[PDB]
Structures are given as C-alpha cells and as structure tokens.
C-alpha cells in the first residue's frame, strides 16, 4: 500500500489533493456500525464490527494512473484494517474477563 | 515561429541539466545529504528550510519560471505546443473544480498548478456560477476548452458526465486543433501520446466491460480500436501485437507499473531524437519535457532518501 | 471512518475514505479525540506508534462508559515492522491474563 503511496508521487505531489477533490465519496466511506451483543458479564458491554463498502475506482473513465492504483490500495488496505479492528478489541474484552473470572476465584477460594 | 530568442534561450538552460552521476548519487547520499545536494545545484536557490515538503516546493516554483515562461511569450507554434503543457496542469484543476465546486469543499484546498489563467480569474471562476458561467469566466483570455465545454453543457450539466465529457472532449478538441501546426514532429509526438493514452484506458478500466469505442479517443497509430476492445475486456495477446512498432518494450511486461515504466522510456527516447532539429520543435520537446523527467526523477529520489527505503527498489525507477 | 498520521503520510488515508486529519498539530490528540466524539459516526480511530497506543485513559475521561473506537496501533510507515510484531503479541499476554 505505502508502495504507492509514496510513489504515486511522481509528480501528483499536490495532485493527491486535486484526486481527492475531483473524486472521493465515490464508494461508500463513513457509516457500517454493527453493535453487537455476545457474553458479557455484571453490567452490559457492546462490541461491533463496521463494514459497509468502501474501496475501488469511482473516477470517471480512466483520468491519472497512480489515482486508480492507489485507490487500489484502500482496498486492500481499509478491509485489512476491519479484521485487527474487531478481533483486537474482543481479545482485550475477553481479556479482562478471564482476569475477572480468577479474580472471585481467588476471594472465593481463600476469603469465603 | 522566432527561433532568435527562443532558441538562444532553450541552449543556455539545457546546460544545468544533472549530470547523470548526480543522480546514480543522490541515492546514496541520505535526506541531509540529499538536501545539501540539491541546495548546491540550482534549484537549491529555493531551499527554503529543509525537508521533504521543502523539495516539493522548491521544485514549484523553479519550474514555474522556467517552463511556465513559455506560454507567457507570444504565440508562435512552440509557444502553442507548450500551451497544451500549461493546458493538461490546468485540466487537472478544472477537474478538481468541477467535483469540488458541486460537492462543497472550498475553492482554499485546491491548490493551482501553472496555468495560462491567471490565478484570480480562476478564483472568479469558482466563484462564477454554473458549469456555464465559470466557462464563460475562461472564454475570455482565448482557450479551445471554454468553448468545448460550453458545447458539452447544452447536452446536459449532470456533474458526473461532465467530468466525462470534460477528460473526452478537452483531448479530442486538443487532437484536431494540434494536427493544424503542421509539421512532423509535433505530430509524432502527439500521435505517440494518443497510443499510449489508449492503453492505459484499456488496462486500467479493465472489466467494466463495455465497447472499445465506448471510451476510444481518435489518433491512433498503433493502439486501434481493436486491441483496445481485446484488452478491456480481458486478454493480455494485445502487448504482444505492439511488437513491430517503436512500442517494441510492452512485450516482455504485463504489470500497470511496469506498463508505465516502459513507456515513459520510450517517450523519453522519441525526445531525444530532436538535437538535429534546432529550428524545428523537436528541441523544445526534448528541452520542456527533459525538464520534466528531471523534476520526476528529483522528487523521487527526494522520497527514498527521507524514508531511508530499499535501494534496489528505487534505483530502477527512475532509470531506463 | 477516521484515524490520524501525519499530513505529509496522510494524504493516502484522504484518497478512499478516511476522512483523516493531521497527527502533528498536537502531541496530546486529546483535541481531536473530543472533535471525533462530536459527531461519533466514527466507530474507528487508530493512531501511530508516533503517540502510544497505552495512555488511553483519556477515550475513558470522555467516552466514560459509552465504548467508542479502540485506539489501533498503525506505526508511522514500515521499514520494519515485524520484529516487533510478534513482540506485540507477547507483551500483551504477560501483562493481561496471567505473566508467564
């Protein structure tokens, strides 16, 4: 992805803005909140995933040639960035947890 | 039409042009180096700080007097040919304008390349009305395009096919009114940039699947309708067909960059033919352009020495 | 949705979505962690290894019960990346859960 990024200045320097002017919000890119529910314990807690679509070509016709391939990148890039998005917050949720769990363990099993 | 200025002129700049050791040097000479190379070479009369965004910069405006100059002379056949230069900068921001305007982003981020308007007027253009009254605002200086895009409102001012028709039809304007200048190196240069254009059309809207000459612009010499259609619609066996022209280097590659890459080099080699035609345009192309892929090839360079990346990934790609 | 590096790597983020604004304006993001709250249809905010993705307690000073994105860790652009990678996987399970 940064391949690109870098390289497509090759003179689009200040082109990135006018690509982002003369096309963005071409393919869906805010809004895709899932809030969802699975165990939680004492007082409730939400996680979610957000997706909805949000990367290729939405240009018209062919225009500059790095623009497509680093709208290419997005991708392959904001679909990546879900998957750590989701599954990193519900391994620390289910973290705290599996922590909590030991913890009554414990006063239970040498308090009580 | 005036060779006497313009050709004293175009012989004295072309001497500041690196050194090609310079830039085997720049690649191993890191981001404070790098900086204290460019400083020392004559666009370093506009370091002015010391950064990345310091080179882009510098770059602007050095080039700005010294291509930008062109246009801004008279009006003889060369001075014409460079208009098209200051012209495709221009697109670009029209473009930018048309999506920005209609969208509601602020004219303040759109930043103004060298153009044949002058800054304020396209600060009025903005500012002037519909698609209609902001051609209006550029009818005024003399430009094919006011007029082209004026013909393409009548037809409808949907935003997303003006922006269509504004990449289709400024270049098939561009096409008829450049073959009136009348000589064959302007023309081969032209017809070359057309083959290339096709192309990468085909490869990149690749699967969108509709017809050649649904997205075909007029000009052809290698690149035709037909392997137009082949490609778009998936088949690789056209880059084998560009064996037997001058394009010889597509068979052999198949990637976008690599596609890229080669004809770059290739445009790059048309240009130099033109240092046996002082007094016809093939120095001015060579020259103008030259400038160009020095400026590509600065800023570049300028990346992998702040970034500190792989070198063998960037030595490459800004050789032929 | 949203997220932050610096203007000058940013740029790629602006292209497709993400609708990104700057990492070097503050040294805090606090500012711009409440100017996200604003509107909150962002569900998603990363950040650079160029802050640290530990000192959240500021997303709890505001969010306060009410989850809103998890801070990400992105890294200002590889050049290396790997190495501490499986390093980030390894110094998270000894402080959570249980050390080794």
């Given at each position: ?112 | ?311 063998a990934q960037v030595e490459e790609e800004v050789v032929c | 949705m949203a997220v ?97």
């Open positions: 992805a940064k391949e690109a990024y870098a390289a497509l200045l090759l003179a689009q320097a200040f082109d990135g803005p006018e690509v982002v002017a003369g096309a963005a919000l071409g393919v869906p890119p805010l809004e895709g909140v899932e809030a969802e529910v699975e165990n939680v314990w004492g007082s409730k807690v939400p996680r979610l995933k957000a997706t909805f679509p949000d990367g290729a070509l939405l240009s018209p016709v062919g225009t500059p040639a790095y623009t497509l391939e680093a709208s290419r990148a997005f991708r392959r890039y904001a679909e990546a960035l879900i998957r750590v998005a989701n599954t990193e917050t519900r391994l620390k949720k289910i973290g705290e947890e599996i922590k909590k769990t030991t913890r009554r363990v414990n006063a239970l099993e040498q308090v009580v | 039409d005036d060779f006497a200025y313009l050709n004293a002129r175009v012989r004295v700049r072309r001497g500041t042009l690196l050194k090609e050791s310079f830039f085997q040097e720049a690649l191993d000479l890191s981001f404070a180096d790098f900086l204290r190379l460019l400083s020392e070479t004559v666009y370093g009369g506009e370091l002015a700080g010391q950064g990345l965004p310091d080179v882009d910069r510098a770059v602007l405006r050095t080039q700005a007097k010294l291509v930008g100059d062109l246009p801004r002379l008279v009006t003889g056949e060369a001075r014409e040919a460079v208009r098209l230069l200051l012209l495709r900068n221009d697109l670009h921001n029209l473009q930018a304008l048309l999506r920005a305007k209609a969208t509601g982003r602020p004219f303040e981020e759109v930043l103004l390349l060298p153009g044949t308007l002058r800054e304020e007027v396209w600060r009025q253009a903005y500012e002037a009305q519909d698609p209609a009254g902001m051609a209006q605002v550029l009818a005024v200086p003399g430009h094919p395009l006011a007029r082209a895009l004026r013909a393409v409102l009548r037809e409808t001012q949907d935003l997303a096919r003006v922006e269509a028709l504004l990449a289709k039809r400024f270049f098939e304007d561009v096409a008829k009114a450049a073959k009136g200048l009348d000589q064959p190196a302007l023309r081969d240069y032209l017809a070359l940039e057309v083959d290339a254009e096709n192309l990468r059309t085909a490869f990149k809207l690749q699967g969108s699947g509709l017809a050649p000459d649904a997205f075909f612009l007029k000009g052809g010499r290698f690149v035709d309708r037909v392997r137009f259609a082949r490609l778009m619609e998936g088949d690789y066996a056209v880059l084998d067909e560009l064996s037997g022209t001058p394009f010889s280097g597509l068979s052999g590659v198949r990637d976008l960059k690599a596609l890229e890459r080669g004809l770059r080099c290739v445009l790059l080699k048309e240009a130099k033919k033109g240092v046996q035609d002082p007094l016809g345009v093939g120095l001015v192309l060579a020259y103008v352009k030259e400038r160009e892929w020095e400026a590509v090839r600065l800023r570049l360079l300028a990346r992998r020495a702040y970034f500190g990346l792989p070198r | 932050i590096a610096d203007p000058e790597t940013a740029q790629g983020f602006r292209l497709a979505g993400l609708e990104g604004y700057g990492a070097s304006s503050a040294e805090e993001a606090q500012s711009l962690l409440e100017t996200l709250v604003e509107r909150g249809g962002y569900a998603l905010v990363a950040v650079d290894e160029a802050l640290l993705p530990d000192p959240e307690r500021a997303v709890e000073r505001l969010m306060r019960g009410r989850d809103l994105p998890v801070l990400l860790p992105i890294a200002g652009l590889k050049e290396a990346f790997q190495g501490h990678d499986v390093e980030g996987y390894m110094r998270e399970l000894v402080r959570k859960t249980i050390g080794f």
